[PDB]
Write a protein that binds this ligand. Structure first.
Ligand SMILES: [Ca+2]
Length: 150
């Protein structure tokens, strides 16, 4: 229920993908500016310094763009990763040994990566990490870093 992110009608994949981009881009204008990402990129997904994602994605600067992410994602390792790949990925990165249940519940992959990187609500089909914050933290950190860097 917001124009910015999460619109009420039906959660489309674009609003979702821009939402996880919006994790960095506070105002969600389609591109994150350096100031917008200040704590956000660094910690919220890079868990240290966002120089990696900023200078890897843009290269010359620090601006990340939703549609550009869309194009990047389709060209990145993430969009190529099938369920098996994502399963080993989710475990080795997200540290969620609930993989059996979750993959059999929703069948995740490179599409699911951005779709699950936003809120527990989306990803928890039935039973998947009781801890909301711990769930969304692990998933957003690794899924988002995966859709962004890969
Ligand atoms: Ca912005």
């Amino acid at each position: 229920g917001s124009h910015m992110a999460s619109s009420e009608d039906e959660k489309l994949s674009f609003e979702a993908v821009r939402n996880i981009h919006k994790l960095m881009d506070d105002d969600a204008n389609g591109d994150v500016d350096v100031e917008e990402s200040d704590e956000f990129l660094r910690e919220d997904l890079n868990y240290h310094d966002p120089t990696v994602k900023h200078s890897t994605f843009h290269g010359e600067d620090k601006l990340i763009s939703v549609e550009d992410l869309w194009k990047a994602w389709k060209s990145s390792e993430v969009y190529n990763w099938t369920v098996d790949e994502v399963v080993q990925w989710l475990i080795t990165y997200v540290e969620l040994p609930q993989y059996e249940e979750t993959f059999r519940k929703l069948q995740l992959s490179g599409h699911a990566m951005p779709r699950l990187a936003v809120t527990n609500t989306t990803m928890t089909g039935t039973v998947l990490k009781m801890t909301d914050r711990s769930h969304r933290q692990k998933l957003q950190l690794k899924a988002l870093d995966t859709v962004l860097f890969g």
